[PDB]
């Protein structure tokens, strides 16, 4: 989400 | 037409540092372009090889480049 994280699987946003 | 004189693979610029974690992962540093031998596993990590090593690599720390012509620029 931020930058160079553990490479998580995206899903939704915050809204 | 048709090309029958390639025999090799493409490359992919390693945008950052990283190392192999899984038993079949590949290691590399920031600027170590790897040789994409295939694209197995998820559609986000490629399969490549660094002058001898190889394995999956998260494309987030990489980019896909074509075949360059020689490295000597001078």
Swiss-Prot record, chain A:
Expressed in most embryonic and adult tissues. Promotes the exchange of Ras-bound GDP by GTP. This is Son of sevenless homolog 2. It comes from Mus musculus (Mouse).
Curated annotation (Swiss-Prot), chain B:
It comes from Mus musculus. Expressed in macrophages. Belongs to the GRB2/sem-5/DRK family. Disruption phenotype: In a conditional knockout mouse model, Grb2 deletion induces a rapid decline of myeloid progenitors (CMP), myeloid/erythroid progenitors (MEP) and granulocyte/macrophage progenitors (GMP) and a progressive decline of long-term-HSC and intermediate-term-HSC numbers. This is Growth factor receptor-bound protein 2. The chain holds residues 1 to 61 of 217 of the full protein. Ubiquitinated by RNF173, leading to proteasomal degradation and inhibition of the RAF/MEK/ERK pathway. The modification N-acetylmethionine is found at residue 10. The SH3 domains mediate interaction with RALGPS1 and SHB. Non-enzymatic adapter protein that plays a pivotal role in precisely regulated signaling cascades from cell surface receptors to cellular responses, including signaling transduction and gene expression. Thus, participates in many biological processes including regulation of innate and adaptive immunity, autophagy, DNA repair or necroptosis. Controls signaling complexes at the T-cell antigen receptor to facilitate the activation, differentiation, and function of T-cells.
